[PDB]
Design a protein around this ligand. Structure first.
Ligand SMILES: [Ca+2]
Ligand SMILES: [Cl-]
Ligand SMILES: [Cl-]
Ligand SMILES: [Cl-]
Ligand SMILES: [Cl-]
Lengths: 149, 190, 156, 149, 156, 188, 188, 190
């Protein structure tokens, strides 16, 4: 019996777990090779590149999701990380789409019951983003009120 | 343009609230063959199914949200979805959030000095739209579990979602304008 | 009777109508939430310009580009905006893969009520494209005429 | 008997011709709606946007080839053109890939004889680019030689 | 005998070895020609910096990004550079579509000499990714040590 | 140069109009097997079809755009498509738009103080190209409703579309240049 | 704060090392049907496997990483994979790297004038995470060589990987901050 | 670094030219079963096939580039490809272009004042690489029209292509450096 999260069926659960682990590792290594060296900083202090840990995670997520990025690595090691991540992303995403085509060709139009899970995930993410933004605004407002005192 | 924006926000908030309340109350959500006796053309909503045409035209029967027999409690996802559909928690939550946003706008028209009321109203309207989206998806998925069609209560709910999103955008814009004017006045007076 | 060819809008056949309307609603909600989390906080403002460029129209443009797998000149920078962007990206990946799995098969199925694709199966896409070009030309001309009239009236 | 250009098989010849015509029309309309209005120019003279005819053609090619661009339209009419072109590109490219998957499964690894035509096209394009660059360099060199005299 | 599972590098199975080596050669040639047409002319220079940013390493990076359908921070602006980029884009579209048509089928075929993909079918991709991360770390550390040694020697 | 661009735009407009009016009025749009009475190789256009071999060679019959079929379960889409094909409204509209653009180019010579005529001509040429695209798609789709090929009347229309788009680009450039000159003079 | 960051890094390093050493030394990596003698529900680890039901409950037998099969047509890839799985070289290497990172943190505490020790600790933690990933993939791939599930030792290893990456990020941040302070002092 | 760059360019140009000439001359391009008499292991190149092992080991026979019978001329693409393969026009063109690039490098080392000779050499080397790519593709495609393998003449050709591309890059860099130095001297003296 198919569930609401049947879109994850083409890949095994272990593949998804290892994808998450690989994403974390790639982001951490990219940030490390971009920011650890004191010779990549010039003169607070300004770095030559924009690949901090948060930006590195954003870059890796954009690369995996076939969505691009506003920044690209420029050094040799950063470009090695980016290229190997691009290769991994191409292989994994192509395999997911090929197996999804195989799963869907077991012409019948797709029903909303098969993508209700992705819709729920989207709405949960939107709610989380609103909550995070409101918490940040409240913290800033409280800090400003304290500074006023 | 503050007056025009406020008038548009209030009118849209009232329209969205009224449309959502009418959609929840009325029972023209779906047009599917069925019975109203505890196969004829029937119109159903969120609570009751009523037959149109035939010998028993106009007879309404409450919707049975747990059909079949033996009460198969094997998968908890199906039970959770069926309970969520039967309660109609998300359309009612949308109605409540729209009412709260309208009350926030009305209160802001009184105080005219606390800017966070406008932001609260905008958040309420956006959340009401999101709750409406979830409720629509839950309703359709539960219906999935014979050509059919959707009546005017369904499309009233959809229009209410659209208007709620528009009113939320307008309220956020008004909040931004209020803070911009405050910052400009502070800069000029400093 | 004669076998029926796919309709002029057969490119919508891979998904159900409910999926399409829910996609439209999700897109509107995503754009509105992105604009809200980007622009509402006064601490992201400096007469006064914003730190980011995610107004409502820019947010709609970004979300449309993300769904079309294209991308634009801007990208969210804050934590809340990037959460919206990432969840929208995941939604787009799933939905677009599901839609494009068997598009060609949906475009050529004959119903009674390998071969190359013919122009008759994509004629509707071509018609929509030309109609969009005409609409854009009309919008540009209307804006030009309005601006010219306003400038002339201001002069006199 | 398959040819060296069998990769064009999934679409009909008329589809390719109309794709070329649509690309030309989209580029021309994009340039027109971006550049015709005198109110889009500010003060030689500088335009608010970068969507000249050559840049518009480059943008349309990048959008169709799933490769992105360095510029994006900002006005309402330009964004209408871009969005309708994006929709057209998504439908057409997805149909091409789906029909190519159907064609290739009429597991056998692809042979070089089936992509020799695309390799020939690539090398011809590289030769053309080198010739164009050399012609431009020679013209500028002759102009500089005249200027020195 | 026992049925043989696909090898650790079975992701290369959709294409022949000749196709792969010709792809490598085409990539090298495209990057070299892009650099040549971008940087050779003295009329694109202003101690002196170039109008564009398409050096040989940047050209290789751009071509690699184009092949992996990713994109980078730069794009060719001249006519010859854009001809190179467009023909490379067409090549990439054709080759990548052909490669990704039946990747999952190639990854799970059992040979005697629908099911979800297992981790054993993509373990090689994971191994390559981790090896690349290790190589990048080693390169960064070697560069750091070289720079530190040079700075210390310059000080003394 | 302004004069060189004017001459190029005029020549291109005339060429595109001539190509379109020739394509509409000649009978070599398609080569296919058919009948010229009431199955030999046959060349056909938009209105009439003639055989080119045998005893029936040289006989032209008007194309039957509404064949007497069973006609049951006939959706309005097919009838609309065949009505559009029979009327040939889009190739003729393209011809009319090209003529209007040419008139605008000619009229601007006697009214050089007015600049919006050049913009109108550019809009006319771009619209003529778009109408040409629509007409081509309609013709090919109606043909499908197994060996065939297109003749020079088809490719004349394709070339006319390309030339019309180029001439529209040139006219828009002329309009931009005229307004640039106006702004430069007004500033100084 | 520097002290807060040092405390967080030390606590995270200790937690990751403890989780990894527990995962390596316990027998709850997997639940599957099997035999603990020489077919009931069975929990297994990296080294030994024990049944949890029936008369054979609590009996642990060493895992046979090289079963006495027909063994013909044995490619070197399968033998290499099963040797890597039997040795468990990657989880143990991850443990060793985490221990080395902790030792580096302590030495930097006792050698505060030296800054490259913090960088070494960060490199050790990132390498331990990468080795953890490789070991997890090797374990899962060797398991494939039909109902099963993972126990708390597997998820202890996963949590150790996540914590190790976080601690490596924190150590790199500390190194960056120390060099920033050095540059600020040198400039002024 | 002009001396080191020039030495590297000359050495690489000579190596690429020698490798391409050896690949064209020698006949270890392919290892496929066949005959040398007008099924045994044979090694073939671009011109002749020779048998290894067996009773007729060492016997060479010229490659028949138009096999089968009836001399079918239905498709001109096949005839064009077969003529291109038989002539081996692209490997020979690669050899000629490499020789021209080497001569340009030598002439530049003699004149030392015309910068366009370096640019000509770089263009020659890049074009030679492209011609070599085309020749490889043509050879493989013609072979397509029984496990086989490629000998050391094939890989010599591949290595020659790689070295030619590297030498072309080096020559372009030298041209750019020469013009940069000229511009810097002109700026200083003005
Ligand atoms: Ca596909
Ligand atoms: Cl009801
Ligand atoms: Cl006719
Ligand atoms: Cl164990
Ligand atoms: Cl030979």
């Amino acid at each position: 019996k198919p569930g609401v999260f049947s879109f994850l069926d083409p890949l095994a659960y272990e593949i998804w777990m290892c994808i998450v682990f690989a994403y974390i590792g790639v982001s951490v290594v990219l940030f490390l090779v971009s920011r650890f060296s004191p010779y990549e900083w010039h003169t607070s202090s300004e770095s030559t590149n924009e690949f901090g840990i948060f930006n590195s995670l954003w870059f890796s997520l954009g690369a995996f999701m076939q969505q691009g990025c506003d920044i690209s690595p420029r050094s040799l090691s950063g470009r090695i990380v980016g290229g190997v991540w691009w290769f991994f992303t191409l292989i994994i995403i192509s395999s997911y789409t090929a197996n999804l085509a195989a799963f869907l060709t077991v012409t019948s139009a797709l029903s909303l019951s098969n993508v209700a899970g992705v819709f729920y995930i989207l709405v949960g993410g939107l709610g989380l983003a609103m909550l995070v933004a409101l918490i940040e605004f409240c913290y800033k407002s409280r800090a400003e009120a304290k500074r006023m005192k | 343009d503050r007056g025009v924006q406020m008038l548009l926000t209030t009118v849209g908030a009232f329209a969205a609230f009224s449309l959502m309340t009418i959609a929840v109350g009325t029972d023209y959500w779906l047009y599917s063959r069925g019975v109203c006796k505890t196969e004829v053309m029937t119109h159903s909503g969120l609570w009751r199914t009523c037959c149109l045409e035939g010998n028993f035209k106009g007879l309404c029967k409450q919707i049975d949200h747990f059909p079949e027999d033996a009460d198969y409690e094997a998968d908890t996802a199906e039970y959770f979805l069926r309970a969520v559909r039967a309660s109609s928690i998300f359309p009612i939550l949308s109605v409540i959030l729209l009412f709260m946003g309208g009350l926030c706008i009305a209160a802001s028209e009184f105080y005219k000095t606390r800017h966070n009321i406008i932001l609260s109203a905008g958040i309420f309207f956006v959340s009401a739209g999101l709750s409406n989206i979830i409720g629509i998806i839950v309703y359709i998925s539960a219906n999935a579990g014979n050509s059919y069609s959707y009546g005017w209560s369904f499309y009233f709910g959809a229009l209410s979602f659209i208007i709620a999103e528009m009113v939320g955008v307008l309220a956020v814009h008004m909040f931004i304008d209020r803070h911009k004017q405050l910052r400009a006045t502070a800069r000029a007076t400093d």
